[PDB]
Structures are given as C-alpha cells and as structure tokens.
Amino acid sequence: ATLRSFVLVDNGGTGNVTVVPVSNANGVAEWLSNNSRSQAYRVTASYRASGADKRKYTIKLEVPKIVTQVVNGVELPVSAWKAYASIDLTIPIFAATDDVTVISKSLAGLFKVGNPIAEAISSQSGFYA
Amino acid sequence: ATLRSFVLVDNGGTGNVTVVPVSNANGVAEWLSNNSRSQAYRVTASYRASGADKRKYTIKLEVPKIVTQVVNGVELPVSAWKAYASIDLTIPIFAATDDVTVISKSLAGLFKVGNPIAEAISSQSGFYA
Amino acid sequence: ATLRSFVLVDNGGTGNVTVVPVSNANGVAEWLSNNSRSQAYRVTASYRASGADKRKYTIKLEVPKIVTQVVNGVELPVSAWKAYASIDLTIPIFAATDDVTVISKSLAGLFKVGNPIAEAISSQSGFYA
Amino acid sequence: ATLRSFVLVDNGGTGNVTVVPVSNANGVAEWLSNNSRSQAYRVTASYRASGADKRKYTIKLEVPKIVTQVVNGVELPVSAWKAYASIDLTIPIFAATDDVTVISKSLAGLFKVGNPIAEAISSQSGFYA
Amino acid sequence: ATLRSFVLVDNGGTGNVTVVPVSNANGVAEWLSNNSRSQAYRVTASYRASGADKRKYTIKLEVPKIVTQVVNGVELPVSAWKAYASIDLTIPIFAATDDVTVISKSLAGLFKVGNPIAEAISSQSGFYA
Amino acid sequence: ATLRSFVLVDNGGTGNVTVVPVSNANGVAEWLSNNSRSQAYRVTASYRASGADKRKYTIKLEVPKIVTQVVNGVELPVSAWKAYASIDLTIPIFAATDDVTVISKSLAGLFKVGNPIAEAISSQSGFYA
8 A cells, every 4th residue: 555654763772753644635745744734744745646647745854953953842933943845857758667767766866865965955955075 | 074075875885976175166166977967966055144143054955867978889878867955944043053953963864765655656655655 | 433323313222223334525424314305414524734733523414304304295305404513623733632622621521411411401501400 | 591601612621611601792602711811712603694595694703722822821923823714604484493403413413523624634645644 | 434445456465555645636536555656556536416316426446567677777766567557436416325335345245255256357368148 | 131120228138228219211221119109219320421431320229208287187108208319420431340349449449348438437437436
C-alpha cells in the first residue's frame, strides 16, 4: 500500500519522526506527524495527469522549527516557526518502469544526506568550491 | 566544499550516474553528468534571501532519456524526452543549525528509496495502491 | 479507517439504523442507510482548511420519515418529510491532540441521550420546561 | 427541568467538565463551565419556529484549547485559543414524538465517541478507508 | 473500498490485465494498467446525480494496441490505435437495493463471455441469423 | 447465430431473465423478455461502419420496475420506472481477431460481478476509498 506511515526523519532509532496518513481527499495523500497541525511535520502528494503527454507528481512538505519550541503552544507568527518545500515532478507518458525508477533514485540521490545539496542546506551555506 | 561532484543515481556500483560542477554564474550552481549538453542529467541550485526574514533554496533536476538519433546516417546524440523536478525550499532566518538539519533530513527521508513517495514514483502510481 | 459503517441510531439491538460509506468524491464522505436513495438516512462530512490558521469539519445529517406512497396502485418508496441537522466545527491549528479530543468529547456530551439538549429535542420542547 | 447543569465532558469521573445555566434571555439557554468567559466551555440553544411548517433548534458550542493554557490568564488572540461549533436542526411540524426521539438519537449516534466522526475529529484526520 | 485494482482482462492466469486506481479527482476515478502511460489500458467512472430523481454512472474504457514506434532510430512505446467504449447508466432514486443488484447483473450478463454480444464483438460480427 | 436468446439476468436457476430476439429491422437487433411489452427487459444492438476505419457497436439496455397500475378499478401491467444503459464501442478496422477478443473480454471484466463497477452499482455507491 502506498498510503502508510513512514519515517520521515531517521535519527538512528532514538528520536525518529514518523508521519502517518491522515486524509485522502481528491487523491491527495496527507501525512501528519503527531503534533498540533501548526507544529506538525507534514507531507502531501498527488499524481494527476498534466497536458496530453505527461503525468505530474506534486508534493509538499512542512518542517517545524524545533529548538526553543514550546510543544503544543501557540507561538506566533507561524511563518517564523516553519519551513516549507514544494516539489513538482513531471514525467512524460513514454517513460517506462526502468526510466521511472531512475528518476526515482535521482531524487533520492539529490537530497541524500552527505551530498552537497543536503550539506549546504544544513550548514546554512550556499554553493562554492 | 558544497560545489562538488556527487552520485545522483546510485545503482550499487555499475551504472552509477555521477554528476560534476560545471558553472557557478549568477549564483546558480550547475552540475552535469558526463555527456554532451544535449543528453546530460543536469542539476542546478541557488540560495538567496527571500523577504526580510526568509531564505530560499531552489533546486532543479533534469533527467534525460538518452538516445542516438540518426538523420541520413548522421547520428546525433540527443534525448527522447526529459523529466523535470523542481524544488523550492523556504526557511525562516530564525532557524538554528539544529533546525536546519532536521529540514535537511526530512527532505532525504521524504524521497528515500523504499518510502511511499519513492514507491509511487517508481511504479507510476498514485497513493490509492 | 474513518470511512466506515457505524450505527446512527441505537435502539438496543432491534431497529438499529446502521449507515454505510457510499462515496467520497470531492472530499465529501457520504454514508447511507440501507434504503433507496429516496428514503435513506444520510450523512456527509468534510474536513478542509479554513483561513490560514483554522480547519473546519462540516457535517450534515438527513433523517427521513420513511413511507410508501401509492399512485394508482403504483407503490413508490418515498419520504413524507426529512429533518436536517447541520454542523460546522472550526478548530484552530494550534489545537494539539489532547485539545482536539476534548472537542470530540464535548460534542458527544452535548448531544448524549439524557442530557438537556437530547431531552428537549426528544419532547419537541424549549428549555423553559 | 430542561435548564439544569450537566456533564459536558465525561472524563470518567475524575476531570469531568460540568457546565451550568447562567442566562436565559429571549429563550436562549446558556450554559457556562466554571471559567472566565474567554476560557469557558459554553453552550447555547433555542427552539424557535421557522417558516409555517417546521420548528428549528439552534445550538452553539465553544470549546477551549487546554494544553499550555494559563488558567484565568489573558491569552490573545482568543481566535487561536478556542474551537467553535454551530448546529441547526430543522424539524417539520408533522413529526410526532417517536420521530423526534429518533432524530434525537441520530444526533447522539453521529457524534458518539468511537464512531468515525468522533474518531476523525480527534485524530486530526479526514475521512478515508 | 470500490476504488480498488481489479482484473480487466482474464486470460486464465497468464496475460491477465490488472488495472489499478491511480487518481480520484473531481469525482472521476481513473484506473490504469502498468504500462507507459502512452500505451496503457484505462478506465474511468463517476456516479453523480442527474435530474431530480436519477443517478448516472459514466464509465469509459480504453483498450490500446501496444507497439514500439521508431523514428530516426529512436524508439518509443506508443499505441498503434485504441478501441473506445462508453457507457451511461441512469438509475431512478427509487431503485432500492434488490433493484440495483438486478441492474448490476444485467450489465454483467449483457457483456458476459459466451453470450451473443461478446461473441459478436470477438468475431468482427454483427447480430445476425 | 448471434441473433439468439440468452440470459440477461443470472439468478442461479430461479428468476433467470431470458431475453429473446424479436426483430432485426434496419440493422437493429431487438431482444425482449417474456413480459407484456409495456413492462419487459429490452436490449438492442447494431454494428455499423463509422468513419473510414472504424466499426461501432451501439448497445442499449432497458431494465423495468415491474408493477400493476390500477385506475378507476382497471388494472394494467405497467412499468413504474426504468433504468437505462447505453454503450458505444468503437473499433479500428485494423483490429484483428486476437485484438477484438481482448476488447471483448475487457468489457466482460469491466462489468463482471464482484469487480468494483458491479459492486458500486449494486450498492448505490460511487468509487471511493
């Protein structure tokens, strides 16, 4: 089943952040961590067709700011306490399985921990040699 | 050391697609697979300030269908089509290192091979499966 | 597992009115009693975001007066009339699980058989009695 | 008597939340828990006639956010610290007692703890199988 | 649990064509087989109200002729042509369960293998004698 | 030998609804059950060319709600209402035998009892999950 809970944050067993399915409206999977929606880790995704020659995946992720956070509190402005991400993946209809798994892996590679993009993000850095 | 080559696609140890830094103009880092520009996997990233209190990473991925076209015995290296991924990451400036890191990980988790998103993509599926 | 049948009307163990899931289009869950649409108890619910910091459950209930009309010996199943209940629930996103739960209970308490509201309704009365 | 205090939140004896009558203007029963009006659990209801063929019950409920709350404090914005609910029940004049008690029970069933609507609310979930 | 994968083509056990649910937006369920979208079996359906007392199913089937096109030495999975089927079912709201079931079975019988319509279809024939 | 009687509704062995060929004028085959024409199941079909390379089956089904009307003490076998189904199949002329057979089976599978479409129909449902 594609709609199942999964570990969104692998902290090596200890502080793992799992996210669960919560809704399914209009074919928009929604996973929520165990927190108030304002402080939750959140993921949404959908696979619609787009144009007459490609399908498109649309995924969104919300990551909370943690340090200093008052769990379950009402800390405003939300805009200051959360990071947002949007991913649009466009895959033309001619792609066959093996093509798709690569695309799949590429994404995984791009954001893998220890790789430049990942490193950069976490070091508040930009890109440079 | 963020601008450095890395493996985009990890097929164990054989067909690994490594991608290298090729330019960094106007704050746009651009990596490239080892192919003619007409058929290379390509990645670009940029880190800029957004608003007076946010920052934004913008990453784009290009996955080609590598093939050799032949027009009158004149074989040209081209791509049947390409898949595109586009990511916008917005992070508040209040985000401390620890905070940033989680974002970092969350992303990696989200797209990890084996998790739902990865699954779905790799089977051209929706989340109803 | 929220989209599942449940007993709408509990008359001990005899005339229990159970209602089952029948559709879920456009994020509107719709349960139905076991009757022709022309005479079924019906319930619908939807959960959407409202504003940039609230969520809203919208629930509607239809209680029919089940009867068999006869026009020229042509007996059709219809409803003499229907009673309608409509509920709007607005909850802040700051609401943590524990918070949500109370809401949950509060509602159930409010309408419980034996409490004032239940009484009044069940005797077509006001609160002056 | 319909205007009496009742347990709005059944926490199994221990932390039960009782709500008491507080006002009765224009046939609008008002029950308040024991708190500052800003943090109180609150219930209002009235039975007016509507149209020339149905009576209507109008009930409203306010549920406070509790976790993190500073009892009796002044925590703004109230909009962030409270959940609201509105119920409109319309019952045509031809309904006789037994009809009404069903309607009555239906409501109770709809919101009963352990049932989908209830479950959904409290799990911050939507509806799906 | 109606939006689920099922076998569209039953060839005993070998070439069975299974079709899965992929999306359900705007009340349109879409099922696809596991092929490059450019050449996959497709089924869509919707159940909506029509008029004041009817419901209307609208089902559409798409059967592809799977092949691999090649142009200037570039091969692409394409569909040589497709067969299209369109079905409209209209049902009164008075239709109670048993009734619906019958309707349900009629369709089945209609298209059942071995019965005239199927035979005709599968032999490029019309209905003769 | 396609214009022949067949079983429209298979109820094991009891209430089987058999439908027979009654006429075949102007390329329209008509099958009726054994009831007063005012209230009989009906099926019609035609196979004609369409365009320069397509064939088109046009099948229509009629399911009656059998009852006996009575007016001024005069009873007549009438139909309380009917469910209508309309089907259009379009097939390229390149479709060779095997192809056609598949198309043939798809339809069967589509409407097969136990598969989603049938289930939905027979339960006043839509396609959900």
